Design a protein around this ligand. Structure first.
Ligand SMILES: Nc1ncnc2c1ncn2[C@@H]1O[C@H](COP(=O)(O)OP(=O)(O)O)[C@@H](O)[C@H]1O
Ligand SMILES: Nc1ncnc2c1ncn2[C@@H]1O[C@H](COP(=O)(O)OP(=O)(O)O)[C@@H](O)[C@H]1O
Ligand SMILES: Nc1ncnc2c1ncn2[C@@H]1O[C@H](COP(=O)(O)OP(=O)(O)O)[C@@H](O)[C@H]1O
Ligand SMILES: [Mg+2]
Ligand SMILES: [Mg+2]
Ligand SMILES: [Mg+2]
Ligand SMILES: [Mg+2]
Ligand SMILES: [Mg+2]
Ligand SMILES: [Mg+2]
Ligand SMILES: [Mg+2]
Ligand SMILES: [Mg+2]
Lengths: 309, 173, 309, 309, 173
């Protein structure tokens, strides 16, 4: 009838590295869709979703997990940035728009949206009360107030018809580096029962993200170049340096998580990507040396004493 | 108040007195003017207005959090908030911050300053008293950075009326 | 099936002078449209565009390159000013409007827009955190937040139907004289993998822009006057003075890049443009002397000590 | 096929006095519509209009010239006040509205608007950075940003269909008494190649505006009274006093340019305009004496020492 | 603090002391009060409040960037921000800026001033002391602009208690 929590985790393991806790938590949530629905009239409506709060750093998987999950469950999905509702002035800038947008992405399938729609509210830690530079704080407290109706259960009007939000699963996220989840408003706090933590990614993890996942960056570039009649191969050592470099600059400058891998690969596949058409029939071996040459030396300075006395 | 920090032999220490005085009368003699920030991996000691100090401290902590906890970068960004048109109110306090890499003193007016060579910092009314005892101790002894701090604080305390003997010394292994 | 990176650069070389790095970077991007699409179902969707950030001064080519490229690829194209979204109050003042505008310029061809639409986000360095005169900074940080959805991949509703932004190529630009690209928000920073630098233009380049490019200013005026039955010809020396003058005033006053050439030519072709109808059958020779007379002497003052003590 | 620059100036000379430079500049612009269009596919699209900036005082002709020109070229025309776009809140308060308004005034004739529409942006010197009383300066810089798209070449949607602005001619104006044209933003500055200066009007010019132009004020009042069966005639001396008075009050009080003539004539034709019906068959001679009586004596005071110590 | 600049023989120099003092006590004696701006093609030296100086410096740098790095124009635009209704807070500091063309002194109150003839500028508490030694050196010697600066700074330092001997001299080839 449907996958079990152990099966769902394995499906996610093919696209995501680490983050066992987050994977586990969403598998339980998806399985509960199936559990109720096996129930009878009375309870089937009384039993509601146990929404999630994923706390964790930038680019470490919080969205991929949510996105992959909806994909494996063929559930209407939607991601929105908490802050986008700071201030409003017209219809489309209201929280209710989250449901219309979701219904519009499923072609109006109302039964679909109600039964198993998923809404990912990114950066909810941004609409709290952090720092003193809090100009319009009533605004942020306000959007928390605007989400309540949705998470607590209500009906919104769409050009496709009325849609209830009683059984839509909600997943929120944040790094919460300054704010804590306890800072949210009581009503919201109680509607996000489950809190899962996602950890930062190490170089060892970077190395695995590079090759293990289905359609990894290394697999993508192999197929892209194969198109131009070029055959490329990454050695174990090469992968390891690409991951060290990525983890290295995320650490010395701005940390963007696994996205850094994309930045580095591009800086690495720069040359071949341009000359691939002129190298048909050949095979290129990307080894340690090739990587140390391509990835030059130490990003760019570290200056900052210009402001110090 | 007296706060001093010494860095030698791969060891960083930051300590201070405990006397809290209202005018010419003492109120508390057991205050902790040195505390650990960012997962307890950065030392911070403060001096000045009780309220201004805490707000300078707090403001700095938010910074460490918005970065990978890099002392220098954080200090520079915090100070930048005073170098603009929006006259961010000034705080009558000072901070001494350190970790395995650097040691800095930050002021509520908006500037960051680094040591000199002997890696010694000191702020507060009793600062320069502990400072001398420390420079002396460093250029003529083999005493640990932890020993120098305690010894200089004590000295400072016997000279400044607003500095007592109830120390709080933190060091970063 | 389609041009190669080396071919595309040559096509661009016919309209743009210099800026090899920027040309190279967009050729690689356009070629990747073709590379994927040669892939199979799984990867074909997983592989996404590597967006670009062109850093460079005013009027040195950043837009012409983007514009020419879309032209040679017959791709739905659109340019917008980052700042235009500072504050919003109605539907049309929202970032989502970028996609509707793009879809509207292609007559609703949804497959076209999704497959190879191009969006040029001009002056993105303006929505950062520069100078102290930052009144509404939350506003600028805000539009960065508004672009994320688009660059990260989402669906927007247009009167023509739903359109995905997963494969639209995005090119952003800036001079970044005060701000740095690292000032953008992490999410955006990671989605603009490639950073190309475009350099200022020298007099030597000016001289080449005047004649080499297809439909250059010298070729345009030759054809315009030919219409009135007049035959004009620019000598090598003449071209050289026009370029020196242009580079000269951009340097002493306001620097507008290659646009200055247009200002100077107009100031030069002033007389002939008016009397062309009365000179049919004749031929005019624009040489050094003709240019030194037409372009008078030194723009206008250099005053400024009026404010000095 | 169409008038030449010398012919166009003569057509304008019948309605406008002085302002040779401005007349000359717009004749060249109109003639270039005809020049390209005689070109072949490639260039015909690459060659674009050389927009104008008319600097000059109040009521000295800047709009009449633009207006007359469009009239003699039967070109869709439109005038708008730069400042009208200071702040926006709804569709109609956006710069794009300039094109819809223009398309609406030509009954949707899209080919007409694109080929030779003319847009006169009045008081562009108002959206600069003048005086210290600059409250919302970002606003003014903002509209300059909003015009760029239009002047640089783009497409706007109208209820009549899509319309390109690539070949619409743009004429901007200002007195620039405090601001300079160099204060505009680089992009705009480079798109307004031609700068023509229009001078103030002297009494001698006033005298000529009174009679020479087709349908001058003196010719209008002659025809108006003729309607009531009255025959009026202005002597040379009379005209001269009307012009002196007009130039006189523009100089001692507020200077409104040639508009002052209308104010004075009305103050002069006050009586006859009322009794014309009772004077049929008669003929009135407006001479020096009639004017000195009608135009009383010295406007009204010159007080101002009320505020001085 | 003492900062002086001399321009002679197609050479421009700008140097200053290194003493940073809090009240009547020194804090650091190795500060760099002279630095290079705009791709290192313009010299700048500052005096006054440690925080106010840096913000005056920074504000000026943003200017050079918004123009083709033209010293004069930049100075005039920065000063214009004080000559309006919006009472842009005043900074208690001063700057000496120079390059291959001109030399100016800009103040945190909003005015720009040019030399006089001998192309000599000087600001700070010790300014006029280095100023005299320099005028003297220029109207009676053949010494390089680089030599005059070092010699005058030293002199100034032996007179002003807030000016030490740890110089930082920058010259524009
Ligand atoms: N743990 C992980 N395993 C595989 N890929 C990852 C992982 N974490 C992040 N990524 C990749 O990095 C990019 C950023 O993903 P994202 O979900 O937005 O992180 P987050 O939700 O914390 O902002 C994605 O393209 C994703 O494929
Ligand atoms: N490198 C170049 N080669 C040929 N023409 C150029 C070049 N750079 C600028 N131009 C011309 O100058 C004008 C300004 O172009 P633009 O692309 O807006 O520069 P930018 O993108 O930096 O603002 C255009 O009409 C273009 O033809
Ligand atoms: N040089 C002129 N010759 C004839 N009439 C003029 C002249 N200048 C202004 N006028 C008249 O004065 C009135 C103001 O015209 P206007 O074009 O708005 O001046 P501007 O463009 O400077 O504001 C118009 O009715 C016009 O007929
Ligand atoms: Mg994220
Ligand atoms: Mg984030
Ligand atoms: Mg004591
Ligand atoms: Mg540009
Ligand atoms: Mg610009
Ligand atoms: Mg007017
Ligand atoms: Mg006016
Ligand atoms: Mg001294």
């Amino acid at each position: 009838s449907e996958m079990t929590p152990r099966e769902i985790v394995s499906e996610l393991d093919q696209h995501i590295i680490g983050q066992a806790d987050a994977k586990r938590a969403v598998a339980i949530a998806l399985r509960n869709r199936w559990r109720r629905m096996q129930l009878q009239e009375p309870l089937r409506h009384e039993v509601t979703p146990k929404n999630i709060l994923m706390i964790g750093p930038t680019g470490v998987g919080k969205t991929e997990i949510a996105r992959r999950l909806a994909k494996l469950a063929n559930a209407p999905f939607i991601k929105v940035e908490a802050t986008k509702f700071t201030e409003v002035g017209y219809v489309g800038k209201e929280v209710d728009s989250i449901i219309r947008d979701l219904t519009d992405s499923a072609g109006g399938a109302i039964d679909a949206v109600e039964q198993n729609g998923i809404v990912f509210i990114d950066e909810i830690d941004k609409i709290c009360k952090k720092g003193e530079y809090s100009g319009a704080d009533v605004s942020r407290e306000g959007v928390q107030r605007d989400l309540l109706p949705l998470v607590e259960g209500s009906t919104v009007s769409t050009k496709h018809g009325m849609v209830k939000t009683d059984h839509i699963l909600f997943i929120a996220s944040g790094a919460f580096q300054v704010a804590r989840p306890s800072d949210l408003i009581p009503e919201l706090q109680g509607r996000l029962p489950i809190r899962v933590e996602l950890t930062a990614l190490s170089a060892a993890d970077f190395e695995r993200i590079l090759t293990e996942p289905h359609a990894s960056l290394t697999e993508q570039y192999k197929a892209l170049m194969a198109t131009e009649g070029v055959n490329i191969a990454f050695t174990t050592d090469a992968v390891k340096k690409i991951a060290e470099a990525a983890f290295r600059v995320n650490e010395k400058t701005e940390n963007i998580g696994a996205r850094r891998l994309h930045t580095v690969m591009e800086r690495l596949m720069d040359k071949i990507s341009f000359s691939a058409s002129d190298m048909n029939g050949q095979t290129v071996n990307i080894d340690a040396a090739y990587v140390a040459d391509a990835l030059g030396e130490v990003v760019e300075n570290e200056d900052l004493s210009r402001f110090i006395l | 108040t007296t706060i001093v920090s010494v860095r030698r032999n791969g060891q960083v220490v930051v300590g201070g007195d405990g006397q809290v005085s209202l005018g010419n009368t003492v109120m508390k003699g057991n205050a902790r003017k040195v505390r650990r920030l960012y997962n307890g991996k950065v030392l911070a000691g403060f001096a000045g207005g009780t309220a201004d100090a805490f707000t300078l401290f707090e403001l700095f902590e938010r910074k460490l959090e918005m970065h990978q906890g890099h002392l220098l970068k954080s200090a520079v960004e915090l100070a930048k908030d005073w170098r603009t048109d929006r006259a961010l109110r000034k705080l009558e306090a000072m901070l001494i911050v350190a970790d395995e890499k650097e040691s800095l003193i930050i002021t509520g007016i908006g500037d960051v300053v680094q040591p000199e060579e002997d890696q010694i910092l000191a702020i507060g009314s009793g600062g320069n008293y502990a400072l001398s005892a420390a420079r002396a101790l460093v250029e003529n002894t083999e005493l640990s950075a932890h020993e120098i701090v305690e010894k200089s604080l004590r000295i400072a305390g016997d000279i400044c009326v607003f500095t007592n003997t109830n120390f709080t010394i933190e060091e970063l292994p």
